[PDB]
Structure formats: structure tokens, C-alpha cells
């Protein structure tokens, strides 16, 4: 019986979870062929498009057994392509990723030999990663190696965008027509940018040709496979696939079935064009599918079950696409196979009214049934959302596998407008990746890396010296033993923050240039608003909205650490700075008195305690002020968001003991959640604390909450969950997502992981299999506060 409402979706789901994660070298081979043929003869954008077209023209293509939506990134499910133009793996990288315990990728010997003999000799010098690393300053390299921040674009393309509605209203033949109209009207006399516009537009036209080739090829393959298929029912499925691919992606979808296939084709495209962060997502899928759903049921070619079956197929298709292999710091900061394909169900419709429709509930049923950690199927809750939809979402959340996450539609809309989006565009918006607010289909909102806010406090406390790397990573802001007031230390901290943010942004500017010049994405550009009209690649600012983020990690840890110092060193004067640093250097060994004071007798973030929460506000504002408004190379601005993925593990690992009681090498806090052991007053206290962070001034904040399974039972639990979401959202909280697990199931899962392969927990903005997480990350989740109502 298992999972899947129909036989078909049961089978596709079973194939999905059994697919072995491996690398598919075919993309690298084909991209090398295209470069050796075209490199040096065309501009880089056209070169990218021609390579993508050459790849789409010659890649093998698979229709899995029983599929209705067709298309895989790699050779087979969980087959990750490689991206040697971004990161050309060394042979040791292939070794590490093949043999690592968690998030491994099998490197077949055929892939290994090809990479060593065909890929490395060509791409070792061309990969953008070396371009980036060789262009970085010494202080950047030291800070990067010291774990002060991470670099999102060392192994992945900026990506991090969401489909809008263009692909349902237009085909790629239509988009090629729009691009050809832009080309005809380019003014090379007066528009001094016309050359760059032409190169980008010409590239987008090729991407449209490539998307059209993709549909022709799949329809031909489907018909061809129908000719040898002896099963009439499967033959008809293949004929339906062919009929679907005759329409999409060349023409706009006319049916609900075609709308989904159009999305997934675009998904495959943009996600093999570049190893883009957060893969891709349809965004407001229920908004886009509903007119197709109503039009199809009225016409009698679709019913609620066929609608659900198709969406369950789409769910499996997401689950077949791992985030391509990461190594080094990129693995540490994103230690997961998931690619954060974040779907927003519910929210408001384009006119700003309640968006919950029939497809909204179909989607809820699909995520419930499929229980797949991809896509990241979440709900947007508006003050206009009918309680039935919120309560139904809680029915799924309380089942304890993390999804759905809850996003505050009104927060999203206001954040977008705060970043400069029109209300018209904001109403099309939502969250992607973990919690990242974006105007879907109209924005490049690029994450550039995690910022180790607690370690900046550490540098502050060591006069710029990093006691872990034993290098002078920061600047000399003074011996804190000489600071006579908390304010002075916090000023010293802001100075360290300014220095570190300066190093990060400086590298980002170099990196943003490298991605703009060396990673143009003509395919993505065809569907993202304003790119065609501007004649400007998405990668150099063609989106209507352009934001860059540095994601702040460890706000809880650093808040409590600064609170511990304000309370104990300056306020109550239980000990002085010199003692605290001695305690920190000793990992609190021999300072049990101090460790207890800062852990249990000092105000803590997440209890509606203004003493600690105002410190959180000062730190968050210091971060917001330090980053927000900085220009991006391509005419946008930096903004701030708070979200860690797995980087709160790494950031804790390369950090020493912190003034809040956190021990050396221990994780820093995740998202904007309280520090480990910090919230002792229940969830209402934490959502009130978290609401004091100005979510509207961010591009998203991540709140993890965990509930004891007993308190979410029945209608009382649903109502309590629904009220907590609404109470947090009524205060403009941005996001809340729930763990509902039995601590003993996870403890046993650690002891016998082979018995709990099913076990999914919520990490940070996503759900993952518990066994894919390091022991440190597992214990971090376990250490999260079990809340009761
Ligand atoms: O894998 C990650 O780290 C991406 C980055 C943010 O979109 C959240 N998820």
C-alpha cells in the first residue's frame, strides 16, 4: 500500500526514494564539447545558450515507468549533473563526495575517468571558482578559511529565484517572438548598451530554441516509446505525454496537465543551465493551476483525482532532483540533498483576496500523501485565509515531518514593499528556499553567504584575533578588558561587524562581476520579468527587482552572549571581562560558576524578556544597518535575511566558547530561534520575542518551533497550532515551522539509523531525513525546546 493515492504515483514515489544519489557526467561532457566548438567565437552569454542548446539537443532523456510529468536533470532520478564551469572538481573531490558519510554522491568509474581526462584538463582553469578564489583578497581568504562567512557562489550559480506566471500564459515560441521583437527594436545608434542587450537577447532566443527542442524531443521519445509499448494503458499515458509535449514548452499550456509539464520542463532547463541555488519552484502553484483546474473540470477532461495524481507526479519529479554535489564549505553550509524547491500554497491571489482555492486543497492532500522532503511544500497564511485551510495545514504539520512551513502572507507582502516592490508585484510574491522573500518571476534575490555573527563577537572579544585559526582575522578594536561600558563593547562589535561585512561585500562585488560575466543564464532570463524587455540577463540585473542577501546566522547565540556580558560584566558585575575570556579560553573548564551564571541566571532571548530581546534588536539592527542599502554591482541593493540551513553547525564548529554558555565547537543557534536552552517560557513567549525582530525590514527570518506530540492532538491541538501561527503572524512574524517528534524515536534513530530511513525532521527552512544529518546537527535538532501549549 505505502504512499501515493494512485498506483502510478505509488510506483513513481517508490522509484524516487530508491534512486541512488550519483553524479551524471553527461552534462559536463556535452558542455565541454560545446565550449571546444564555440568558446572564443561568441560572447559568453551566447556561448552559455549554445552550450545549453547543444546539451538539450544531445542529452539522453528518460521517461520513467508510469510518469505523467516527464523530465530529469541527470541520467536518472537522483542523478546530479556536474557543473565544471562553476566548480571543476579535483579527483580528491570526487573521492570525498563518493566516500563521505552523509550527502554522498556515487562517482562511477566511467564518470571519474571522464572527469579526470576530459573535464579537468579543460575546466580546471576555466571554472569560476578559481576565478573567484584567485581574485579574493588575503583578508577575505583568511576570514573565509576562518569561518567568518561563507561564499554562495564558489560552487553554485546565484539562482535563488521562483517562477512567475509567464510560462502558463506564453510558450517559448511566444517568448522567442518577444525576444525577436526586442532584437528588431534595439537602437545601436543611441543605445550604447545595445551590444550587451543584443548578446543577452540572442542568448535568450537560443534558450527558447533549446526549450522548444526539449519538448519536440520528449514528444518524439514518448511517441517512439508508445510504438514499442505493449501495455495499452501505458501506451495511452505515453500518448498523453506526447500530446502534452506537443504543446509545452513551445506553446502556452492549455490544460492543467500541460501547465504542470510546462513548469517541470522550465524547471529542468534552468536547473541544468546552471547549478543554481534553490533549484526552481512554481511559487504560487495553486494560483497558477486553479484557472486550468476550473477550465478543465468544466470541460470534463479533468477531475479532482486526476488533478491530484498529476500533482503527485510533479512532487516525485522534484524529489528526483538532488542539489548537485557540494564539497568544502558549501557542503558544510548546505549539508543536504534537497534543493529548496519552495512551493507557496494558499496566501492571496493577484487581486489581494484570499487565494485558497480547490487546487490549494489538492496541493495539501498531495504533500500529505507523498511525504517527500522535495519539494519544500509550504503554506502562506493570510489574515484572509479561511481557518479550514490553516487548520488543514496544521493537520499536516503536526504529523511531524516539518512540512508545511507557515509563511505570513501579510509579512511577505510588506517585506516586498519595503524592498521597493509594488503592491501589485508584492501580491505575486512569497518565500523561496528556506524563508527567502521574493517577488516571484520578477526578482533576482541572491543569497551571497552566511555571516558568522557570533564569531564576529568572538573576534571582538579577542581584539580581532581568531583563537580558533590563530590568525588576526578581524581588526584591532581594543582589549575588551579596557571597555568600561557595554555600549563600548557593542561599538567594538559593530566595528568588527563593519570590517567583516566590508570584506564580504568586497568579495561579493568581485564575485557578482564574475557571475554576471561568466555565468549568464539566458534561459532563466526568458521567464523572469524584465529581462527580455530590458535586454539584460538575469545574472546582470535583468530582473525587475534585484536584491542581494547576506544571511545572518546565530542571532540567538550572539544575543545571549552579548546579554550575558551586559548582565554579568557590566550590569551585575558578577565577573569582569578578563575572567570571562579566561573562562571562554578554557571552554569553561574550571569556571563552573561562570558557566552556570550565563546559562541559567542571565536573561535569555526568546522569553518575551525585553532585557535580552532589546539586545537582539540592537544586534539585528546593527546587522540590518551594516548590510541593507549597500549597492550591488548590477543596480540592486543588499538586504538582510536570517536563515542558517546547516551553516549554524559549521559556524559553531570553527568558533570557540561564547559568553552565553555555548561551548567551544558547539553549533550556534539556528534561524532566529532561541539559543539551546534559552526559551523556558513556552512558544507564546518565543513568538513574542521573535516578533520584536523587524521581519518586515528583512527578506525573511526562520523560526523553528518544536512541540511535544501530545499537545498537538485533536481539535484542541489544531486550534492551538492555528492560534500560534496566527498570533505570531498577527505580530508580523514572518515564518514558523514545526517539529513534532518523539525525542526517543530520534535517539533510537541515531543508535540504529538503518531502522529509521523514513525519519524526516525539520532542519532549517526544510525537512530532511534524520540520517542525512551529522551527529552534531542531529543533536542540535534534539536540543531544540520541546514546547507545550
Ligand atoms: O541550500 C541552501 O543553503 C539554500 C540557501 C538558501 O536558499 C536556503 N537554502
Give the whole-angstrom CA distance, residue 451 versus residue 367. 33
DSSP 3-state of 444: strand
Atom 6 in ligand 1: which residue has the minimum CA distance?
Answer: 433
- Cβ-contact 725, 691 below 8 angstroms: no
Which of 279, 334, 338, 443 maximizes ligand 1 atoms within 8 Å of its Cβ, making it the mutation to test the pocket?
334
Q: What phi and psi values does residue 444 have, to the nearest 5 degrees?
A: -100, 105
Give the whole-angstrom CA distance, residue 367 versus residue 363. 6
- Cβ-contact 70, 222 below 8 angstroms: yes
**DSSP for 613-654?**
HHHHHHHHHHHHHHHTTPBPTTS-EEEEEE--TTHHHHHHHT
Residue 527's contacts (CB-CB under 8 Å, 6 or more residues apart) are 163, 164, 166, 167, 175, 266, 270, 441
Is there a catalytic annotation at residue 26? no
Helices 453-461 and 577-585 cross at an angle (nearest 10°) of 120
Atom 9 in ligand 1: which residue has the minimum CA distance?
Answer: 433
CA 516 to chain centre: 20
> Rg of the chain over CA atoms, in angstroms?
25
Q: How far is the CA of 667 from the centre of ligand 1 (A)?
A: 18
- Cβ-contact 636, 547 below 8 angstroms: yes
Q: How do beta strands 406-408 and 735-739 pair?
A: antiparallel
Dihedral sign (CA 283, 288, 293, 296): negative
Atom 2 in ligand 1: which residue has the minimum CA distance?
Answer: 334
Give the whole-angstrom CA distance, residue 212 versus residue 227. 23
Catalytic hit among 394, 434, 521, 647: 434
- Cβ-contact 354, 384 below 8 angstroms: yes
Q: How far is the CA of 323 from the centre of ligand 1 (A)?
A: 10
- Cβ-contact 441, 528 below 8 angstroms: yes
Q: Where are the alpha helices (DSSP H) in 628-742?
A: 647-653, 683-691, 714-730
Atom 1 in ligand 1: which residue has the minimum CA distance?
Answer: 334
Q: Delineate the domains of the chain, giving CATH numbers in brackets.
A: 5-789 (3.20.70.20)
Whose cell is 579566561? That residue is: 582
- Cβ-contact 615, 566 below 8 angstroms: yes
Q: How far is the CA of 666 from the centre of ligand 1 (A)?
A: 21
Which of 765, 767, 772 maximizes ligand 1 atoms within 8 Å of its Cβ, making it the mutation to test the pocket?
765
Q: Is the CB of 278 under 6 A from ligand 1?
A: yes
Q: 10 Å Cβ neighbour count for 134? A: 7
Give the whole-angstrom CA distance, residue 187 versus residue 173. 24
Å resolution of this model? 2.5
- Cβ-contact 577, 665 below 8 angstroms: no
Give the whole-angstrom CA distance, residue 99 versus residue 109. 13
The length of the chain, given as a count of residues: 789
In terms of C-beta density within 10 A (0-12 exposed, 13-18 middle, 19 or more buried), how is residue 189 classed? exposed
End-to-end CA separation in angstroms for the chain: 35
Give the whole-angstrom CA distance, residue 737 versus residue 146. 31
Give the whole-angstrom CA distance, residue 79 versus residue 106. 9
Residue 190's contacts (CB-CB under 8 Å, 6 or more residues apart) are none
- Cell readout for 765 is 527552512
Residue 109's contacts (CB-CB under 8 Å, 6 or more residues apart) are none
Q: Which of 451, 461, 471, 469 is nearest to 492 (CA)?
A: 461
Q: Which of 307, 401, 332 is nearest to 144 (CA)?
A: 332
Give the whole-angstrom CA distance, residue 686 versus residue 679. 7
DSSP 3-state of 550: strand
DSSP 3-state of 452: strand
- Cell readout for 492 is 567594538
Whose cell is 521567464? That residue is: 527
Is there a catalytic annotation at residue 436? yes
In whole angstroms, how far apart are CA 690 and each of 19, 41, 707, 719?
Answer: 39, 54, 17, 21
Give the whole-angstrom CA distance, residue 652 versus residue 664. 8
Give the whole-angstrom CA distance, residue 176 versus residue 184. 12
Residue 54's contacts (CB-CB under 8 Å, 6 or more residues apart) are 30, 31, 33, 34, 37
- Cβ-contact 437, 451 below 8 angstroms: no
- Cell readout for 43 is 560572447
In whole angstroms, how far apart are CA 138 and each of 144, 146, 471, 550?
Answer: 10, 12, 12, 20
Across 341-355, b (16+ Cβ under 10 Å) vs e yields bbbbbbbbbeebebb
Catalytic hit among 418, 436, 618, 675: 436
Residue 780's contacts (CB-CB under 8 Å, 6 or more residues apart) are 648, 649, 667, 670, 676
Q: Could you say which DSSP state residue 668 is in?
A: P
- Cβ-contact 225, 200 below 8 angstroms: no
Whose cell is 515531518? That residue is: 401
Q: 10 Å Cβ neighbour count for 50? A: 24
Q: Is the CB of 454 under 6 A from ligand 1?
A: no
Angle at 391 between CA 388 and CA 395, to 5 degrees: 130
**DSSP for 280-320?**
---SSHHHHHHHHHHHHHHTTS--HHHHHHHHHHHHHHHHT
Q: Is the CB of 79 under 6 A from ligand 1?
A: no
Q: 10 Å Cβ neighbour count for 99? A: 11
Q: What phi and psi values does residue 192 have, to the nearest 5 degrees?
A: -65, -10
CA 261 to chain centre: 23
In whole angstroms, how far apart are CA 26 and each of 19, 161, 378, 648?
Answer: 18, 25, 33, 34
DSSP 3-state of 24: strand
Q: Which of 445, 444, 494 is nearest to 474 (CA)?
A: 494
In whole angstroms, how far apart are CA 327 and each of 133, 286, 354, 772?
Answer: 15, 36, 43, 15
- Cβ-contact 585, 676 below 8 angstroms: no
Give the whole-angstrom CA distance, residue 394 versus residue 391. 5
Give the whole-angstrom CA distance, residue 10 versus residue 366. 12
- Cβ-contact 641, 437 below 8 angstroms: yes
Question: SS3 for 354-396, per residue?
Answer: ECCCHHHHHHHHHHHHHCCCCCEEEEEECCCCCHHHHHHHHHH
* Cα dihedral 212, 216, 218, 220 in deg (nearest 10): 180
Q: Could you say which DSSP state residue 567 is in?
A: I
Q: Where are the alpha helices (DSSP H) in 731-774?
A: 743-751
**DSSP for 49-88?**
HHHHHHHHHHS-----TT-SS---SSSSTTEEE--TTT--
List the determination method.
Answer: X-ray
Q: How far is the CA of 551 from the centre of ligand 1 (A)?
A: 10
- Cβ-contact 149, 511 below 8 angstroms: no
Give the whole-angstrom CA distance, residue 302 versus residue 119. 47
Helices 44-58 and 194-228 cross at an angle (nearest 10°) of 0
In whole angstroms, how far apart are CA 43 and each of 49, 159, 209, 249, 454?
Answer: 10, 21, 18, 26, 43
Nearest-atom number in ligand 1 for the CA of 323 is 1
Q: Is the CB of 436 under 6 A from ligand 1?
A: yes
Q: Is the CB of 320 under 6 A from ligand 1?
A: no
Q: Is the CB of 650 under 6 A from ligand 1?
A: no
Q: Which of 413, 336, 457, 429 is nearest to 762 (CA)?
A: 336
- Cell readout for 377 is 511544500
Q: Residue 554, by phi and psi: left (phi above 0), alpha (psi -120 to 50) or beta?
A: left
Residue 274's contacts (CB-CB under 8 Å, 6 or more residues apart) are 83, 86, 156, 157, 159, 519, 521, 524
Across 306-334, b (16+ Cβ under 10 Å) vs e yields bbbbbbbbbbbbbbbbbbbbbbebbbbbb
* Cα dihedral 436, 439, 442, 447 in deg (nearest 10): -20
Helices 232-247 and 256-273 cross at an angle (nearest 10°) of 70
Q: How far is the CA of 340 from the centre of ligand 1 (A)?
A: 7
Give the whole-angstrom CA distance, residue 200 versus residue 194. 10
Q: Could you say which DSSP state residue 661 is in?
A: S
Angle at 653 between CA 652 and CA 659, to 5 degrees: 45
Angle at 608 between CA 605 and CA 609, to 5 degrees: 65
Q: Is the CB of 447 under 6 A from ligand 1?
A: yes
Q: How far is the CA of 352 from the centre of ligand 1 (A)?
A: 28
Q: Which of 336, 303, 305, 339 is nearest to 319 (CA)?
A: 339
Q: Residue 649, by phi and psi: left (phi above 0), alpha (psi -120 to 50) or beta?
A: alpha
In whole angstroms, how far apart are CA 61 and each of 56, 115, 217, 331?
Answer: 9, 21, 8, 28
DSSP 3-state of 433: coil
Amino acid at each position: 500500500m505505502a504512499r501515493g493515492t494512485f498506483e502510478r504515483t505509488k510506483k513513481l514515489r517508490e522509484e524516487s526514494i530508491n534512486a541512488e544519489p550519483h553524479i551524471s557526467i553527461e552534462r559536463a561532457v556535452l558542455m565541454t564539447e560545446a565550449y571546444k566548438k564555440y568558446e572564443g567565437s561568441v560572447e559568453i552569454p551566447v556561448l552559455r545558450a549554445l552550450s545549453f542548446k547543444h546539451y538539450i539537443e544531445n542529452r539522453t532523456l528518460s521517461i520513467n515507468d508510469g510518469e505523467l510529468i516527464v523530465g530529469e536533470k541527470g541520467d536518472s532520478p537522483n542523478g546530479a549533473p556536474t557543473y565544471p564551469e562553476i566548480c571543476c572538481h579535483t579527483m580528491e573531490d570526487l573521492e570525498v563526495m563518493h566516500n563521505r558519510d552523509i550527502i554522498n554522491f556515487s562517482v562511477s568509474e566511467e564518470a571519474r575517468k571522464i572527469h579526470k581526462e576530459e573535464i579537468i584538463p579543460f575546466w580546471k582553469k576555466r571554472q569560476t571558482r578559481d576565478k573567484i578564489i584567485n581574485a579574493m583578497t588575503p583578508e577575505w581568504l583568511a576570514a573565509y578559511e576562518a569561518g567568518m562567512f561563507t561564499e554562495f557562489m564558489e560552487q553554485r550559480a546565484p539562482g535563488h529565484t521562483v517562477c512567475g506566471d509567464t510560462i502558463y500564459k506564453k510558450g517559448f515560441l511566444d517568448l522567442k517572438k518577444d525576444i525577436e521583437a526586442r532584437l528588431k527594436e534595439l537602437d545601436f545608434l543611441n543605445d550604447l548598451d545595445a551590444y550587451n542587450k543584443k548578446a543577452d537577447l540572442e542568448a535568450m532566443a537560443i534558450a527558447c530554441d533549446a526549450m522548444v527542442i526539449l519538448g519536440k524531443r520528449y514528444a518524439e521519445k514518448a511517441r517512439q516509446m508508445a510504438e514499442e509499448e505493449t501495455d495499452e494503458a501505458k501506451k495511452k499515458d505515453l500518448l498523453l505525454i506526447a500530446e502534452t509535449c506537443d504543446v509545452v514548452p513551445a506553446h502556452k499550456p492549455e490544460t492543467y496537465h500541460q501547465a504542470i509539464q510546462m513548469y517541470w520542463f522550465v524547471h529542468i532547463g534552468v536547473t541544468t543551465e546552471l547549478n543554481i541555488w534553490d533549484a526552481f519552484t512554481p511559487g504560487r502553484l495553486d494560483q497558477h493551476l486553479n484557472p486550468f483546474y476550473e477550465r478543465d473540470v468544466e470541460n470534463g477532461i479533468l477531475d479532482r483525482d486526476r488533478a491530484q495524481e498529476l500533482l503527485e507526479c510533479l512532487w516525485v519529479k522534484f524529489n528526483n532532483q538532488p542539489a548537485p554535489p557540494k564539497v568544502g564549505i558549501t557542503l558544510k553550509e548546505s549539508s543536504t540533498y534537497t534543493d529548496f524547491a519552495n512551493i507557496n500554497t494558499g496566501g492571496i491571489n493577484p487581486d489581494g483576496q484570499d487565494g485558497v482555492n480547490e487546487v490549494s486543497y489538492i496541493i495539501l492532500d498531495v504533500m500529505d500523501e507523498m511525504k517527500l522532503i522535495q519539494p519544500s511544500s509550504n503554506v502562506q497564511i493570510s489574515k484572509k485565509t479561511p481557518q479550514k485551510f490553516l487548520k488543514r495545514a496544521c493537520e499536516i504539520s503536526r504529523k511531524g515531518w516539518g512540512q508545511p512551513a507557515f509563511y505570513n502572507t501579510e509579512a511577505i507582502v510588506q517585506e516586498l514593499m519595503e524592498a521597493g516592490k509594488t503592491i501589485e508585484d508584492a501580491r505575486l510574491g512569497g518565500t523561496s528556499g528556506c524563508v527567502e522573500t521574493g517577488c516571484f518571476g520578477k526578482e533576482a534575490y541572491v543569497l551571497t553567504g552566511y555571516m558568522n555573527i557570533p564569531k564576529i563577537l568572538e573576534l571582538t572579544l579577542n581584539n580581532g584575533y581568531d583563537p580558533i585559526s590563530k590568525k588576526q582575522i578581524g581588526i584591532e578594536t581594543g582589549d575588551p578588558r579596557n571597555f568600561q561600558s557595554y555600549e563600548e563593547l557593542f561599538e567594538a562589535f559593530k566595528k568588527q561587524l563593519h570590517y567583516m561585512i566590508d570584506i564580504k561585500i568586497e568579495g561579493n562585488a568581485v564575485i557578482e562581476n564574475i557571475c554576471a560575466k561568466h555565468m549568464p543564464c539566458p534561459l532563466m532570463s526568458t521567464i523572469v520579468d524584465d529581462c527580455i524587455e530590458k535586454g539584460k540577463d538575469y545574472q546582470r540585473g535583468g530582473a525587475r527587482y534585484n536584491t542581494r542577501y547576506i544571511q545572518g546566522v546565530g542571532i540567538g547565540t550572539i544575543t545571549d552572549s552579548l546579554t550575558a556580558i551586559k548582565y554579568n560584566v557590566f550590569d551585575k558585575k558578577k565577573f569582569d571581562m578578563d575572567t570571562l575570556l579566561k573562562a571562554l579560553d578554557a571552554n569553561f573548564e574550571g569556571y563552573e560558576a561562570i558557566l552556570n551564571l550565563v546559562s541559567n541566571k542571565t536573561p535569555k532571548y526568546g522569553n518575551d524578556d525585553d532585557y535580552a530581546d532589546e539586545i537582539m534588536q540592537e544586534i539585528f539592527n546593527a546587522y540590518y544597518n551594516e548590510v541593507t542599502g549597500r549597492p550591488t554591482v548590477c543596480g540592486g541593493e543588499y538586504r538582510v535575511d536570517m536563515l542558517p540551513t546547516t551553516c549554524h553547525i559549521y559556524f559553531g564548529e570553527i568558533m570557540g566558547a561564547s559568553p552565553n554558555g555555548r561551548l567551544c565547537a558547539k553549533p550556534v543557534s539556528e534561524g532566529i530561534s532561541p539559543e539551546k536552552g534559552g526559551d523556558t517560557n513556552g512558544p507564546t513567549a518565543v513568538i513574542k520575542s521573535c516578533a520584536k525582530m523587524d521581519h518586515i525590514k528583512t527578506g525573511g527570518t526562520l523560526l523553528n518551533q518544536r512541540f511535544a506530540p501530545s499537545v498537538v492532538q485533536g481539535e484542541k491541538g489544531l486550534d492551538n497550532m492555528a492560534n500560534l501561527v496566527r498570533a505570531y503572524f498577527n505580530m508580523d512574524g514572518h515564518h514558523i515551522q514545526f517539529n513534532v517528534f518523539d525525542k526517543n524515536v530520534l535517539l533510537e534513530a541515531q543508535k540504529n539509523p538503518q531502522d529509521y530511513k523514513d525519519l524526516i525532521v525539520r532542519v532549517a527552512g526544510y525537512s530532511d531525513h534524520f540520517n542525512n544529518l551529522s551527529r552534531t546537527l542531529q543533536d542540535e535538532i534534539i536540543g531544540r525546546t520541546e514546547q507545550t501549549f
